[PDB]
């Protein structure tokens with residue numbers, strides 16, 4: 001089928017009167033600027049590539065905002081995690097699926113067209129495996145199918161409570177697999193994920209949760225085409241503990257011991273010294289920045305200006321899902337750099353002075369790379385994932401090109417996203433998703449159960 | 451008239467089945483918890499007092515988001531300011547009113563029910579006064595009335611380009627009044643403002659823009675019942691320059707030379723050292739925190755936890771209007787403290803662990819004080835200014851009490867605000883303002899004219 005955009009952000013920049021042909025399998029087949037609409041569906045506003053969400057723990061949306069209660073004069077990431085543990089202890093397979101489906105609907109409405117699910121809840125309530133060990137992974141895939149969002153599933157290897165292979169704690173029992181069970185899970189998942197059109201990646205929870213020898217095992221297992229994700233250097237405590245264990249910082253240790261490259265997504269990477277920042281940018285790995293969660297958890301501020309100046313690659317994730325907003329993540333990525341430096345206009349390129357466009361270009365590319373999917377740009381052969389902004393909005397209607405990105409990302413909000421397409425299929429129209437009522441009804445029931 | 455809420459945040463806390471009686475003049479006449487909804491409008495979700503917006507420069511909304519372009523390797527507040535000066539040089543009285551009306555509609559949709567307009571654009575393009583010196587102030591009052599938002603107009607005394615009574619620059623010419631002209635402007639405004647149900651306050655632009663003697667003149671002029679607002683200590687450069695001028699920091703200087711009290715709103719106050727924070731808290735002045743604008747301009751992070759812990763009073767303002775969101779300001783107020791300390795759950799009270807409720811309670815109280823209006827709480831004798839959240843939203847519907855505030859402020863957004871009432875009149879219903887279509891058409895045309 002064909003769609004027609006008066007304005008669209010193409011790989012070479014903004015274009016006018018672009019007619020897109022989309023094949024039956026949801027792939028961009030033809031892109032012609034300066035064309036006639038000729039029968040094609042005339043879109044209602046400016047068209048951009050959809051934004052990949054490169055980091056998600058779906059079930060956490062259920063408790064989003066609920067952990068904002070002072071129980072200590074020094075509440076932190078670590079007291080929060082205790083609360084997150086107590087909540088994950090109670091989740092049934094059915095509740096996990098309902099929460100995921102609801103979350104993916106909200107993601108779509110925000111302009112996220114594909115998600116990397118960093119999925120570590122594997123087993124039953126007492127830590128025993130389900131009859132089908134892939135139970136919860138399969139439910140995540142079905143939820144994504146139900147919402148219609150792109151999906152890279154990252155089943156997570158989690159084995160230990162801390163550096164040096166500390167025994168897993170009771171709070172972590174639903175997460176735990178040895179390497180053999182983990183590799184078997186990856187194998188079980190190939191057939192169903194392939195049928196769904198969904199993607200797969202390798203994933204270590206963190207250097208706290210797996211041993212160096214386990215990393216070696218998984219990396220030698222022959223899945224050499226898959227993305228590799230890991231939480232790293234999010235909290236100073238992890239840095240300190242790594243130092244006491246190895247005499248190295250986390251990112252420093254990773255680069256000394258593992259052949260980190262473009263396959264890799266380093267989630268957070270918050271506490272990266274100048275040498276670590278340099279190593280990251282050189283490697284072509286993607287920094288997975290989750291700005292709203294990092295602020296919510298008091299993680300700190302990433303050295304994004306230094307990283308970007310050295311050619312670093314990044315993308316955004318909603319992580320704990322306290323925020324589901326492309327606008328908020330990109331805006332406060334920039335604003336955090338401004339608050340630190342006490343200056344404006346921090347994240348731009350030598351060839352691109354526009355801040356919004358710099359942020360959007362970056363997150364699109366990093367996100368696509370991290371998910372391992374053919375997305376993040378409107379070019380022939382890429383998947384037809386896109387969003388349509390509000391053409392009747394006075395700020396956007398009066399703006400042109402990159403000025404329009406600035407109006408949206410810095411002066412506007414989520415409501416300016418009106419229509420959302422994933423793999424050639426309209427999943428949000430005029431702010432509405434066809435599954436929203438049914439999902440909200442099931443979701444509110446689950447919230448009551450929790 | 452009468453409305454009925456299944457849940458409402460009253461001054462004593464959350465209550466159920468609250469019937470509100472509203473007088474003909476839009477004042478809360480009776481508030482009855484655990485009542486029935488007979489002959490009263492059944493409200494569609496949780497009811498909260500409306501949020502005062504304690505600091506606004508309306509015209510800046512027209513340029514919001516457009517100054518996000520690297521022009522230098524390390525862009526400054528002062529390069530932005532020159533950019534703002536460039537648009538102000540073009541604004542007509544009509545454009546001013548149209549921008550303000552549109553802005554105030556958007557504010558209402560976000561849950562802001564009253565605004566303090568920190569208004570310093572006074573004169574014609576060449577710096578000469580309009581035939582009616584109050585022309586542009588009156589335009590602001592007329593726009594607030596068209597939107598239906600509560601208004602405290604703060605005409606700004608602006609006389610100088612810098613400490614020590616430096617001559618004002620050409621770019622500042624539309625702002626400039628001497629003390630006597632400013633005081634006459636205040637007198638001219640009293641009748642039309644009261645006729646519209648609007649309030650007035652005293653306002654000095656900053657310590658850079660007025661002299662100590664001008665401050666003394668204005669404060670001695672007999673308007674002892676009005677709020678007093680001032681931009682202070684926003685940028686490190688102002689701190690450095692004040693120090694070079696007086697041997698004192700800006701807040702330190704103000705407290706040493708002026709009787710600062712509960713009438714005062716100190717806008718930004720970002721660079722406050724420990725002694726200055728203590729003096730602010732002890733004085734009962736309101737800190738006017740404009741979080742989105744402060745982040746956008748790279749001002750820095752206010753010591754909100756230290757200030758709050760000592761009994762400090764605060765409220766929020768949208769300032770340059772890059773953001774129009776009660777959610778965003780309160781959320782990033784807390785989050786800024788989290789990023790600085792690398793800890794969670796920062797702004798709480800000894801008697802209130804709930805972060806959302808701590809933030810809302812504080813901003814309501816400080817906002818109301820700073821505006822000098824009878825707002826900020828649902829109590830008999832206060833104005834019927836309120837918002838209704840979305841009762842169909844699954845996050846809110848499944849929450850009770852302060853948990854509901856946490857879901858909204860930390861996990862939700864502006865769209866959860868559905869209905870908004872100011873002075874007993876519905877001005878937003880189901881997310882829609884009746885004047886939005888007319889306003890947007892005039893507004894988009896003005897944007898075309900300016901840009």
Ligand SMILES: N=CN[C@@H](CC(=O)O)C(=O)O
Pocket residue numbers: 057081206231234293297319320
């Ligand atoms: N924001 C971090 N969340 C992590 C916590 C961890 O790294 O242990 C997690 O959900 O597993």
Ligand SMILES: N=CN[C@@H](CC(=O)O)C(=O)O
Pocket residue numbers: 507531656681684743747769
């Ligand atoms: N955020 C700063 N705005 C101020 C600038 C100033 O203090 O000169 C203003 O609009 O007057």
Ligand SMILES: [Zn+2]
Pocket residue numbers: 055056057118231267319320
């Ligand atoms: Zn994570």
Ligand SMILES: [Zn+2]
Pocket residue numbers: 505507568681717769770
């Ligand atoms: Zn201001």
